[PDB]
Amino acid sequence: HHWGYGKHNGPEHWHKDFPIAKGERQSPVDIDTHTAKYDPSLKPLSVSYDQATSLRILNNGHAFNVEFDDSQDKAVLKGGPLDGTYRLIQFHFHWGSLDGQGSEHTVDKKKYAAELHLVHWNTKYGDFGKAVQQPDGLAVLGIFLKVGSAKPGLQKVVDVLDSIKTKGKSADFTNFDPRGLLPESLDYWTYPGSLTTPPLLECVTWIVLKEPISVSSEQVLKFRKLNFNGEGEPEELMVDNWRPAQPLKNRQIKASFK
Ligand SMILES: [SeH]Cc1ccccc1
Ligand SMILES: [Zn+2]
């Protein structure tokens, strides 16, 4: 009876196995755009993905991860609110059953159709498993998806999903350039938070871009054909794999822009 996104095992149940679910810096949160303060001391983000080496795509039973070679400084996030260098390890998405829901963060209570998470770990802790034990261990770049025009740079991901339909399936996924998933502007909001899936560790500096990317209805419909279940098991479509907004508590959201 493992955690997931159902009635009997969804987000309102996670606290029984993971008591930090009710902690002081949980994610996601609603971003109240009028309350977020412009912090003129924040720096421009530095997103350096030109040497990124993608390896594999995995259906892990709760999302799909596009995994990168993180054995060297090849794809790194620095600047903005960050001290030091964070290495890209994977990206994944969270999405809905319908276009009106799917994002984890919200903006003035608005839900987007999906949300991309580019996960990076702080190289001063040496490995990802050590980094998640630290309050500044991870930096996650969050990007909202709205449905409209297709995102050309997403199509290579969309077209491999039929090969990883069910939990535990993986496929080779080399030479994928994550620069084709970025919006034009790197304006962002930032706050201290957590992983949005168990173990819900409070180790993340969140950097949430203001500008959403557009994807087509056909692109998101293919996300919604994935399965939470393993091969041969009753089909349960992989939809609504998002955690709702959590209490902000004693936190301030800072804006990079006026
Ligand atoms: Se919800 C972002 C995230 C997912 C898996 C591991 C680290 C961070
Ligand atoms: Zn995520």
Distances (CA, A) of 31 to 89, 101, 157, 181: 26, 16, 28, 22
Q: Is 119 in the pocket of ligand 1 (CB under 6 A)?
A: yes
- In 3D space, the residue among 32, 41, 198, 185 whose CA is nearest the CA of residue 106 turns out to be 32
In sequence order, what E strands does 134-234 have?
138-147, 170-172, 188-193, 204-209, 213-215
Residue ranges with CB less than 5 Å from ion ligand 2: 117
Query: How many CB atoms sit inside 10 A of residue 90's CB?
Result: 22
Task: List residues with catalytic annotation.
Answer: 62
Q: Is 195 in the pocket of ligand 1 (CB under 6 A)?
A: yes
Domain that holds residue 111: 2-258
Query: How many CB atoms sit inside 10 A of residue 144's CB?
Result: 24
Cα 27 to middle of ligand 2, angstroms:
10
Query: How many CB atoms sit inside 10 A of residue 127's CB?
Result: 11
CA angle, 247 as apex, 145 and 131 as ends, to 5°? Answer: 70
Q: Look at the chain and report how many structural domains it folds into.
A: 1
The Cα 36–Cα 40 span in angstroms is 13
Distances (CA, A) of 182 to 17, 48, 154: 35, 12, 10
Q: Is 29 in the pocket of ligand 1 (CB under 6 A)?
A: no
**Resolution limit in angstroms?**
1.2
The domain that holds 237 is classified in CATH as: 3.10.200.10
